[PDB]
Ligand binder design. Sequence first.
Ligand SMILES: [Ca+2]
Ligand SMILES: [Ca+2]
Ligand SMILES: [Ca+2]
Lengths: 488, 488, 488
Amino acid sequence: MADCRAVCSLNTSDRCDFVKRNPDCHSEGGYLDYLKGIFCYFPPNLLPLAITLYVFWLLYLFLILGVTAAKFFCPNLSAISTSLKLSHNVAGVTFLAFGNGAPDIFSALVAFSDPRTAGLAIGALFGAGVLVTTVVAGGITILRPFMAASRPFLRDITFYMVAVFLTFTALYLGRITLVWALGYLGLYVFYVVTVIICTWVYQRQTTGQILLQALNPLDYRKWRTQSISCKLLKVAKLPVEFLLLLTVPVVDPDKDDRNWKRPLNCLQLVISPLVLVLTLQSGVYGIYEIGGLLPVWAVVVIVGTALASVTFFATSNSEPPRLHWLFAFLGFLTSALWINAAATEVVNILRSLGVVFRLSNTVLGLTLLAWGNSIGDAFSDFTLARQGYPRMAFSACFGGIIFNILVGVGLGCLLQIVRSHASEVKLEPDGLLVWVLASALGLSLVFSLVSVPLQCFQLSKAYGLCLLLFYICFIVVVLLTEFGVIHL
Amino acid sequence: MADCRAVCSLNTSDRCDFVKRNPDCHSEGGYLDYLKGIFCYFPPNLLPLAITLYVFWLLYLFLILGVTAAKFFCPNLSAISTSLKLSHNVAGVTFLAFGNGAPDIFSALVAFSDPRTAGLAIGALFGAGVLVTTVVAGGITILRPFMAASRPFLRDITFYMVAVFLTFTALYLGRITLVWALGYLGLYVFYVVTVIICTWVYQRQTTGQILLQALNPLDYRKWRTQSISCKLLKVAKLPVEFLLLLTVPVVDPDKDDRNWKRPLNCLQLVISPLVLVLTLQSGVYGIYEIGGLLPVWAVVVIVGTALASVTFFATSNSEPPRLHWLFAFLGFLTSALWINAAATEVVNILRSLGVVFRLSNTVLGLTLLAWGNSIGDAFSDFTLARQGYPRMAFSACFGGIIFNILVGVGLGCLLQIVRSHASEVKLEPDGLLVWVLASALGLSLVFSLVSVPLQCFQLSKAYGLCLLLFYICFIVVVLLTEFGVIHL
Amino acid sequence: MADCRAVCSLNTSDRCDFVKRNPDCHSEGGYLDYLKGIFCYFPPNLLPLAITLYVFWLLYLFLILGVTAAKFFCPNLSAISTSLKLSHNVAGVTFLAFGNGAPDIFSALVAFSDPRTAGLAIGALFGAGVLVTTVVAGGITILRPFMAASRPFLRDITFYMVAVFLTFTALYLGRITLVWALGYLGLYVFYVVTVIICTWVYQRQTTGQILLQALNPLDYRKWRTQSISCKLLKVAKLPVEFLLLLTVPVVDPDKDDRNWKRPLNCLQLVISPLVLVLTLQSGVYGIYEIGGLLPVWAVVVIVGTALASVTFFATSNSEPPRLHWLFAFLGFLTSALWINAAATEVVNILRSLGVVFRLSNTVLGLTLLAWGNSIGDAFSDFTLARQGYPRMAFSACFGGIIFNILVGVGLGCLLQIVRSHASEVKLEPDGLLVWVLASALGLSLVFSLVSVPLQCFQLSKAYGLCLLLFYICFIVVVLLTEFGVIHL
Ligand SMILES: [Ca+2]
Ligand SMILES: [Ca+2]
Ligand SMILES: [Ca+2]
């Protein structure tokens, strides 16, 4: 049973049958098979067309991931937390990190779930770390010079350096054991507690019309006000936000009504469980037939419609019911499962590209996956800096990467340990490129640790332009290593 | 026959005879044979002295090329164009590009005329591109910070990126066909038309004394005013400007007399045709004897002196004749042929150095030829920036490289196609250094394309210093590649 | 007799006996044997603990070297010079260079004294040159922007470039002859004379209480005023300064009493000769027994105590004796011998680390030895810049490296020539790393030579941040070369 890569060394007439036959070209989950798409669906003459279509689909999936994380995942998480009365400053610091890091976390979970894709996770986490500490942080200082806060900066840079070196040693050892994963998660909890304690010590020292409106994602006044490019982006997002509005309930403590849309919410009381059962483990559980007579989805629909009718007749259009926060729980779950589905598709596409072109998991992780997972960071942080909040954006840069690495490695490896019933996760490093990537991350961190205090925490355009030049040269070295020009 | 370079591996006593015998050490054109100079005329103990003398001669030739292009080629071209009503703004943008790019164009023509030297042309064009976009543009921003105009910058950077990638693909294919060369020239014409249209849409939205003076290149008042270094440079140029004044007529629409020097111009009516044929094809046609009795140069002299006498007796000292623009045509032709002769000498010297030291055409093209061809850019653009016109200088930087690459490749390859009666010009790339050079040019362009809009087009010293550091590291990598430290 | 690097490839039980037996693992001088410490005294499980202890001891030795040079060597040299009325401006320029460069000079002398350690000297001198011209000079411009003086800068950069290229050619030739060493020292004398002449041409154009106090190194008022880190450093230095106060006499022309401490000085009239005889050449001559009856140290003590009693009874507590400058001579000698002992220990430690880990002399010289020898430069120059004297600090940066290279190579090689009775010092370069280091130094110098005049000598944070990025990338390339990633 040959490897999947062998496909390109066969004759064109046996490619499609090889892909159909070889179990090493089959994916664990997902809905589309991109390799059968390339080698059976598409004429070989039109292979570059298939690949460009794949790239466009990948970019659109990154758009989906960003929108879902920004507008449906974090608001519901914030509703749940505000039900427990936190603080505005910790909220601002940390919820921005959760929102920016949901795609990285779910991509790492999906990649770690399979030994053939596990190198993608390391490539993407370290690659996003390099990109966010050079290009995004430097861009913030180029757009708006400011004076950084010294003590939070030193705290964040120290915690990040520790996490990075821990992962270096786990890579050298070649494995992640259960104790290591629990240690990663514990270190993240310790970091959040330290932030809390330090901040405290410093502080002391008609229904039809509302249905139509609720499902409309366009603000016509704002749309007319915007420029052409903003208009084009809005339309690029319209179908996605329509589906998200249809399926994901949202609870807003900021609004006086808490986004209580009676009929849309009662409809979602049917729709959301169905989407959950149809997207869980790729809907495998959906077609499971109970007792050989009734499938799971039918009984889900029955219970959902009964509960929807009961809620609709036991609630009022003006006043939300006393149990309106359970809707936040449900919307959090549905949004998480949507993000998981999109991440699964992205990982499958990247694996297919690696098979077709014989590219390593590390190089695909550190370029395409990292850039796609950092689009959201770039948008949110550059917007924050342009609005006059560059300290918050700069802090979010270093606070989100800590969450990415610690929670991504710890949770992804823990879930793989538990489901496989094994005792460890194998980290087989693929050549010299992983050590090149590690070296780049370390030296970027060293540059900032020396440079920022030397400027007395007054940051401007020179620091950012130096970081930009560094990232350019890093991509230089990566491409030279991937094509064999630099070999030990 | 034996390879020209095998000369060193011989005994000293057979070197001179080997060079005299081997047809692979002979040049197509020129007046001096530098290899016979090294191996026949000088003793083997004084080889480094010969090489230093060669380097000094090469620098002096670059001085000649710069002066001829600046003060005799462009003024006559401008006279011809102003005879047709050119605008002031397009004139300023584009005539500076022609003046800065004449040496690059003629060097590329000469190098493409021979398969042994064709790698020099690619090395010099890409190398000058890297040098002008880093060192010259950065130096402009270091000398005088300014706000760049966004739309012209984006237009220029886009056109340059397209031209560079087109040449990358022609290099990968390994040839330039006739259709490709015509496409290069057509794309340049399209670029000039686009500049015109965009600018328009934006705008709407005694005789003995005069002979003595005309042949004197010194301004005594200015000379006494200048410092020591400027004085030394003027003297370094005096013999060259004397010969240029003697042989090249100049027409100036700025002056009210249009530089009408009656007796000097009537003398030049004899001298200039003689220089043209004697430097045409390195003078081969000059000694062609018509009918076996009268050589070409004698009949040229006869016709020239008859025409000079007729013009002298049919014209007045105070009022130029009504045909004074034909003198601009003649001066344009004579200046072009002088530039061609100097470029031929430079290319022959570089080939001899490559034979003696076993250096590749790419490394000689990207260091010595590129620097020599960019001395004029540095002088003109830094002077413009120091006088308070940094926007014009910065625009000239990116507008001159487009002319260099498109017209140099297109015209040089087209002339070689037509002259050889072949169908294609073979581009045999010499190792890994050409791809190193391509990578440097591309990333430099990427750095500017990201950096300039991110600064909101406000350019200062930090951007320029980063570009300078980049160029230093590029020369690092080039020297490491040439000596084999990085390799496949 | 196997090369002592093969110690590791043996079984653990024969390591200690191998080290005890092999003469290639024995040092020329010093007091401790670090290899027997690693392989005989400690258990094989605690090797990393031994190495961390060695590193801490090495850092403490660098602290000792810095304190001795700053507070005991230079003050006595200044007393001797001020006895001859030297210029204050020249004093400020040049005495800072002697103080900053004493550790480099003595480390080079010790390393050149043995063929097994001679590569350390070249690595440390060039490495300190790279570090001081990038990190220290850039840090000065980041901490306090200023306008540099053009003529001193151009003079210094020219002299340094000449010295560096001279050493490149000596490395290519593979030796230092006696004429070369004398030429190095003569060129340094020429440089100092040139500085003098240029500056001139520009200018024209109870006893118990006093012993208790004299031996106390703490200033309680200042100590209480300082912060926590300064306090910790003070204690880190207390035992060292106690021993230095005990053994090294100091003469201060600034004080009106010239630091005349009658009883401490009379005690030092005994102590200092004893320390000299106990630390010269590791104490060999100390135990030499004259005539087989009386050792040298006993007769030294007898003469010292007689002379101390005579001086004590022939001098007054209030008025220093007429011969108070001989104490400056004695204190200069004692301080020099203390510095020599500390440098010997540092070199022996570095050789042991190279044996244990199979590291080259070049990489150990350019990282650990260079950083340790430049701690003093960083402290004094950054302190000078923060106090409002960045021109003096920036000048000291380029003036101290000239002293380091010229006097270190010239004097170290001359002393080795004379003592060995040979005619030359062999410079066997160790691989490609030495040429990597040479390339880094040259281009750094080129970057400054172009950049500083282009800014019109107005230096700010952008220039310094570029230099910092360069040094980071240099350490990149060094580590890649040491591990074989780049190679021939
Ligand atoms: Ca992200
Ligand atoms: Ca040019
Ligand atoms: Ca030093």
